[PDB]
């Protein structure tokens, strides 16, 4: 029971599966699409201190990954290099074939130390971390991501109507993921 949205005449209605209204025509798997949309586009605060308050560490929950075929240009991506004060890794290395988000104007690269009190870092509002055509529930080390969400669509029969430089800003942080966290941008 996941909302499947069917495009009508220049409109999007989520087709209700309990009833069966046949005027929708799906003649091929090419009409099926998954799309990633950025939370940025809804007006959420993008400042680093604001963004990092949405993430938190937790033990006991296995991570999960789901693919998507098409995405949105992001203005802001993030890239984390966080270690414990003795010097240890609190973010797991990217598995084979998880690469960074393809298109973002700004990559905010944050380095520093924190308590990292948990095995994996999750999104407190339940959104996803978007990578190159793979959305994950957790943050990987040293890999640029965007915050976003996934939708599934039945596209219309006509193909045609539907479907580069980057900069890095560096920050140092102490007490990352705490009530008061110290950042200095270089």
């Amino acid at each position, epitope marked *: 029971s996941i909302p499947l949205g069917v495009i009508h005449n220049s409109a999007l209605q989520v087709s209700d599966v309990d009833k069966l209204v046949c005027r929708d025509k799906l003649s091929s798997t090419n009409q099926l699409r998954s799309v990633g949309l950025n939370l940025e586009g809804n007006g959420v605060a993008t400042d680093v201190p604001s963004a990092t308050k949405r993430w938190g*560490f937790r033990s006991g929950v296995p991570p999960k990954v789901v693919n998507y075929e098409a995405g949105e240009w992001a203005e802001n991506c993030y890239n984390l*290099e966080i*270690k*414990k*004060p*003795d*010097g*240890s890794e609190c973010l797991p290395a990217a598995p084979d074939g998880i690469r960074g988000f393809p298109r973002c104007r700004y990559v905010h690269k944050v*380095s520093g*130390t*924190g*308590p*990292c*009190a*948990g095995d994996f870092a999750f999104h407190k509002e339940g959104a996803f971390f978007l990578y190159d055509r793979l959305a994950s529930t957790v943050i990987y080390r040293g890999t640029t991501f965007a915050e976003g969400v996934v939708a599934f669509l039945i596209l219309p029969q006509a193909k045609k109507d539907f479907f580069y430089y980057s900069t890095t800003i560096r920050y*140092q942080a*102490t*007490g990352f993921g*705490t009530n*008061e966290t*110290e950042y200095l941008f270089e």
Partner: antibody
Amino acid sequence: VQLVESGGGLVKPGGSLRLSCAASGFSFGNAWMNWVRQAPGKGLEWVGRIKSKSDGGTTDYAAPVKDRFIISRDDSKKTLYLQMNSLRREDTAVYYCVRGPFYCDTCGPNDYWGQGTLVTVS
Amino acid sequence: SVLTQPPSVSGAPGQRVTISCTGSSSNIGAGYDVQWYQQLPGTAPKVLIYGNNNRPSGVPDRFSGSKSGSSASLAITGLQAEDEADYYCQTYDSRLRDQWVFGGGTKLTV
């Protein structure tokens, strides 16, 4: 694994001394190094830390000792150095170098601290 | 925000004792590990407990510990003559720019 710290000697108040901690037996280049001290009769104190080259290479210092001590390292000689200058009284203590991350599969005890070098100011 | 510790603890041979280390909401309850060191008179500290629960190879299982709220405990059961030492608890302060903080130390006697 060995940490050998040397260069502690009697010093007149206001003078300068240099301490070295030569490491062997482990991946020196991938560890964070700390200097701590213990004054006679009292407990342990932390003076400073230096990070690995791969993580910035920056140094932090405790508030009493900041601006008078400088910590550095040389990965070509595997040596940690603490330069003490403007050595005003109240710095008398045994100094120790502490090595890296505590998370070791097989390192075991007696592999994280040295033996201790006595520095007296008089 | 500096960790506290009792001046000294005592106990009969063969029994269990616990050493308390009490911190603050920025030190232990913020999610940082607590380490325990044993300094025998005349020598240098050796690592006894690291990462709140872990023991390095070679340390007897008589030594353990735990963390709760803003405090931590070290439990040693079966006191032997060789256990006389000064014990220190350590953690990372989060309001002091992630700098080491040490406990006052507790002397053990048998």
